[PDB]
Amino acid sequence: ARRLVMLRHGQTDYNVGSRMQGQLDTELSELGRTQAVAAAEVLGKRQPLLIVSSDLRRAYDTAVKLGERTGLVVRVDTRLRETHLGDWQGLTHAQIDADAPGARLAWREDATWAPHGGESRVDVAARSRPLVAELVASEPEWGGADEPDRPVVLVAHGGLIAALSAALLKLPVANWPALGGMGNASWTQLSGHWDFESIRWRLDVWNAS
Amino acid sequence: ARRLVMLRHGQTDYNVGSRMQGQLDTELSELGRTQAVAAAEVLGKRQPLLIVSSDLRRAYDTAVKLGERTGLVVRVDTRLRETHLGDWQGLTHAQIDADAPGARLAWREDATWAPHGGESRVDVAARSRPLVAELVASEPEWEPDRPVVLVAHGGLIAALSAALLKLPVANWPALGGMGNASWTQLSGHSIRWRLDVWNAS
Numbered sequence: 001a002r003r004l005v006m007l008r009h010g011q012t013d014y015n016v017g018s019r020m021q022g023q024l025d026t027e028l029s030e031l032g033r034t035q036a037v038a039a040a041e042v043l044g045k046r047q048p049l050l051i052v053s054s055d056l057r058r059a060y061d062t063a064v065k066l067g068e069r070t071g072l073v074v075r076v077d078t079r080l081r082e083t084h085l086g087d088w089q090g091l092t093h094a095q096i097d098a099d100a101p102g103a104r105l106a107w108r109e110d111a112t113w114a115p116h117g118g119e120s121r122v123d124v125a126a127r128s129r130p131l132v133a134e135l136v137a138s139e140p141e142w143g144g145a146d147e148p149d150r151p152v153v154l155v156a157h158g159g160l161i162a163a164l165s166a167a168l169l170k171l172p173v174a175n176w177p178a179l180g181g182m183g184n185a186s187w188t189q190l191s192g193h194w195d196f197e198s199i200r201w202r203l204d205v206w207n208a209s
Numbered sequence: 210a211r212r213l214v215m216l217r218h219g220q221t222d223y224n225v226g227s228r229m230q231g232q233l234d235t236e237l238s239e240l241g242r243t244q245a246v247a248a249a250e251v252l253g254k255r256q257p258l259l260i261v262s263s264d265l266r267r268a269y270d271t272a273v274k275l276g277e278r279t280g281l282v283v284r285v286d287t288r289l290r291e292t293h294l295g296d297w298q299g300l301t302h303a304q305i306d307a308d309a310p311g312a313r314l315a316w317r318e319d320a321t322w323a324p325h326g327g328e329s330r331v332d333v334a335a336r337s338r339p340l341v342a343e344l345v346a347s348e349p350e351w352e353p354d355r356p357v358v359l360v361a362h363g364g365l366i367a368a369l370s371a372a373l374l375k376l377p378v379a380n381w382p383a384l385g386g387m388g389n390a391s392w393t394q395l396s397g398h399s400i401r402w403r404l405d406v407w408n409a410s
């Protein structure tokens with residue numbers, strides 16, 4: 001079995017202000033940096049095989065602390081970026097609700113709906129799922145005989161993680177909103193048991209702190 | 210929206226020996242009581258509204274440590290019992306696999322399959338889900354972030370959670386087994402449930 005760990009970036013100042021980011025490249029807050037230190041310790045002990053991060057700095061900075069704790073290089077991939085949120089980037093929840101009452105809630109319940117200029121959950125899965133497939137192909141050590149519990153660690157964002165997870169689990173799109181919201185520096189683990197499609201993923205942990 | 214928290218029982222002696230329990234009333238082990246304390250600590254802080262426990266002692270006792278921690282009567286409902294596992298109750302993994310090779314694994318992948326004499330995951334969801342809807346009706350208070358806590362079992366939690374999420378039966382095996390004294394949180398916003406936490410320790 002292949003263990004896949006997915007870590008949401010630590011707290012940013014925008015998170016503190018309930019302000020939407022998307023692919024705006026915001027900074028970790030001080031608290032966010034200490035969160036990343038704490039998470040690296042926990043995940044470091046699990047002895048990751050590999051670290052792949054979103055190139056957005058809030059994720060990348062989170063990933064670098066795990067790299068320091070484990071002596072692994074941090075690989076970077078734009079396909080792990082958070083959902084592009086188009087017109088909503090830079091606005092707060094309150095601001096969005098004032099303009100479009102009910103649009104946020106509606107967005108949340110429809111995995112095919114994108115904000116104007118942005119991405120849907122389905123779009124994000126379409127870019128991120130093949131990356132997991134590439135790592136299955138490129139990392140023979142993963143779930144291999146020697147050390148089969150050593151996880152691949154993807155460091156990213158909450159939207160990306162829900163989308164990628166639902167897609168790996170092969171939930172129908174209509175059910176993707178069943179997956180909730182990750183905490184800052186919280187993680188999710190899937191296991192892939194066994195062609196890439198033949199892999200059967202299950203959810204071991206959603207949103208551990 | 211309403212928070213629903215579901216806690217699996219602490220470790221039993223049967224768990225250490227990979228021995229199936231079902232609705233056999235087995236006991237918490239030493240380590241299991243310890244686990245139940247620690248979990249009581251964490252979950253007490255979220256200021257639970259109310260507690261329902263399976264009447265099985267491994268679950269009931271687990272619930273008690275939280276009840277003590279926060280001062281509420283641990284309500285009991287037999288509808289929170291673990292999957293009845295028929296012929297498998299009392300048998301070990303090694304034992305089941307020797308008699309019916311591949312049945313145990315295949316069972317995990319089919320929410321509709323029951324051990325002979327026992328219940329399927331679909332059966333378990335149908336009997337336990339009415340308890341949640343009853344608590345929706347009979348409990349006005351739903352401070353709306355205070356959680357309702359169900360203390361129960363790994364099978365029951367997976368099945369009930371999948372049913373609340375309205376996952377298709379075919380996808381119910383997407384949910385992996387809960388750790389001992391680990392918990393899950395659903396949020397209900399008919400109501401649409403989402404998964405906030407699966408198998409936190």
Ligand code: VN3
Pocket residue numbers: 008009015021022082156157158159
């Ligand atoms: O705040 V995020 O990009 O998960």
Ligand code: VN3
Pocket residue numbers: 217218224230231291361362363364
């Ligand atoms: O082994 V338990 O009844 O979840």
